[PDB]
Design a binder for this molecule. Structure first.
Ligand SMILES: NC(=O)c1ccc[n+]([C@@H]2O[C@H](COP(=O)([O-])OP(=O)(O)OC[C@H]3O[C@@H](n4cnc5c(N)ncnc54)[C@H](OP(=O)(O)O)[C@@H]3O)[C@@H](O)[C@H]2O)c1
Lengths: 358, 358
């Protein structure tokens, strides 16, 4: 069965990738596209300075970009993805929720809101239960389906937590966590980055440190709001860097378990290679069976040689070994195809589709 | 005016030694050694000049010699070594036994209990072990005994440079992380590194972890051997990466003090600003009096923006801020001219000469 999909901020970078993906999806129909006044009225192909290495089909190319209001075609969408600029996403997404619509957003605005799930779909799909219970209890009493928002974490946060989930399931809570990122370009000018390193990405470290606590966190007794891992319970230290690499974020991570003793390296590696995410078990269309590709070569993963090879995995993980300060260190290569805003967004909608929320 | 030898003169480290010595009035380039397939040839005909700056042509005409203590090598007041580790142990041993003063970049003798491992802007006082030994041999036999001082690689020197003043002021550091983003400056081809990250430098993390504890360690009661900091009292975790950058290693670092409670972030910044290395206080020519350059901009240091401008400091240090796991984190940029093998070696020779060990 085909659900109708809308895209807010459709002309932007993340918006482009949303439409590109949904275009190949057998379960979704691109029904409404939204951007600013500068774009409204134009065919998508004229509204968007297309920056993807892949071209878009003609039928999607001719679709007329609409204003970002819960109106006409947007009121007809079963799910509304959002890559809106944060300057406008606040007001707009709220009115979409108010109109009773299902919003899956990459905007940072509502990420830290207490009743809003912050979801890396290959890691914490269970955090969606909060909206699931709200929705299903509302409709069972005969009332109108409330409308809600689920937020998509960034590629960097998603890369950090991805290997952590199986490890936390098997060996219990992680109380200490470091990450130094080596982040790719995919604005950053050639002037800024060529033969250079910028040891600062604005807001990225606070994002990384705070979001991971919510994603790996829990819910309050009333089951309506999220209770992120408190600071006394888990320390997270991020250092983010831009590097002269076109595609694929690398993270050099360190971790310690709260429960003693630490497992063995082989148990850790075996845990990571064996993990199947909840979304795969639900039978979701865009979910990877295995979310992690464990690599044994001592110089792997590398962004350039493992980008395509492992594009079916959430992350590639290499150099898993015992640490000198915490328990283990390892190297993580994110894959945009799976854990990128667009890929994460579609999977959330599939999870919503299964479980009958949309 | 001291006469200088260079072993493994044709290699990357040898080239840097020769170049830097030619710009130095206190030294005379007196002997050059390399492989037997180089021996008997002018230096320009023996070497593939991989440097940016060209050599004065009078230096180019120097005939390279076999790596043996035999002719011009026997008259050198200091012999610098840039031999590969698979032959260096044999040759450097011969030189020491011939009575010569060896300053080596090779790894072979670094872990020896009696051999100083020196980052001369950090632990020049470790040379006192050699000094007292030479003092002992003069009283006993009349002649100098022959010795090795080992030079730490640029990566270790970068880590330890800002730590020295901190430890002097606030006491020992019991925990320390580093993720490095290391410049090209086996080799490393463009094919490996361009538009890519290589999360592995062979032996690098091991050296970084072990050598730190010795460099920041002490001397036994008799002043005859080195007592590196016990593993339990300083946990050091390194994660080394190669990036597409020509010159200037970046290190993303975290540290915690053993002495509780921690100083403030303001105390730390000013401690680094006020540090003047002891080699500068001795009057050594190559030692930077402003050893550390702290930068206040949120996006600095950057290798390409700061490598020429800060080429006369040991390190530039930026983004000094409170940490959430350990006490503080910060971004460190190394300056090869000062703390690289050649620059470090010349400074050691300057200290040796000032202290009459020659
Ligand atoms: N070279 C140029 O002239 C130029 C132009 C655009 C972008 N860029 C660069 O490329 C990047 C791509 O942009 P982005 O996706 O990061 O962010 P963005 O374009 O500013 O915003 C993302 C999406 O939000 C929409 N939007 C913005 N303001 C809106 C409003 N007031 N009401 C409703 N929708 C609104 C945009 O549609 P609209 O397309 O209608 O604005 C776009 O689809 C930018 O960060 C920028 O650096 C350069």
């Amino acid at each position: 069965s085909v659900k109708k999909a809308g895209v807010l901020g459709a002309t932007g970078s993340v918006g482009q990738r949303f439409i590109l993906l949904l275009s190949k999806h057998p379960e979704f129909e691109i029904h409404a596209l939204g951007a600013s006044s500068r774009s409204a009225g134009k065919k998508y192909k004229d509204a968007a300075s297309w920056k993807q290495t892949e071209t878009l089909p003609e039928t999607e190319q001719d679709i007329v970009v609409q204003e970002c209001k819960p109106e006409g075609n947007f009121l007809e969408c079963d799910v509304v993805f959002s890559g809106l600029d944060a300057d406008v996403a606040g007001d707009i997404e709220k009115s979409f929720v108010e109109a009773g619509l299902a919003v899956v957003s990459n905007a940072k605005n509502y990420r830290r809101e207490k009743d809003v799930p912050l979801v890396v779909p290959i890691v914490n799909p269970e955090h969606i239960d909060v909206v699931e219970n709200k929705v299903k209890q509302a409709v069972s009493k005969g009332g109108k389906k409330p409308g809600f928002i689920i937020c998509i974490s960034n590629c960097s946060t998603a890369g950090l937590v991805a290997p952590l989930k199986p490890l936390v399931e098997k060996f219990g809570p992680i109380d200490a966590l470091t990450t130094t990122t080596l982040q790719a370009i995919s604005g950053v000018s050639g002037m800024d980055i060529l033969d250079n390193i910028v040891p600062y990405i604005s807001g990225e470290e606070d994002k990384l440190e705070w979001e991971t606590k919510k994603i790996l966190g829990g819910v309050n007794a009333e089951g309506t709001e999220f209770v992120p891992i408190p600071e006394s319970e888990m320390k997270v230290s991020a250092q983010c860097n831009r590097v002269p690499v076109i595609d694929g974020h690398t993270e050099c991570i360190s971790l310690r378990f709260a429960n003693r003793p630490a497992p063995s390296v082989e148990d850790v590696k075996q845990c990571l290679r064996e993990y199947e995410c909840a979304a795969s078990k639900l039978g979701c269309h865009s979910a990877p069976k295995q979310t992690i590709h464990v690599l044994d070569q001592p110089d792997r993963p590398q962004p350039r040689l493992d980008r395509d090879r492992d594009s079916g995995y959430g992350v590639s993980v290499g150099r898993i070994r015992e640490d000198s300060l915490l328990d283990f260190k390892m190297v993580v290569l994110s894959h945009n195809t799976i854990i990128g805003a667009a890929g994460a967004g579609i999977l959330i909608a599939e999870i919503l589709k299964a479980k009958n929320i949309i």
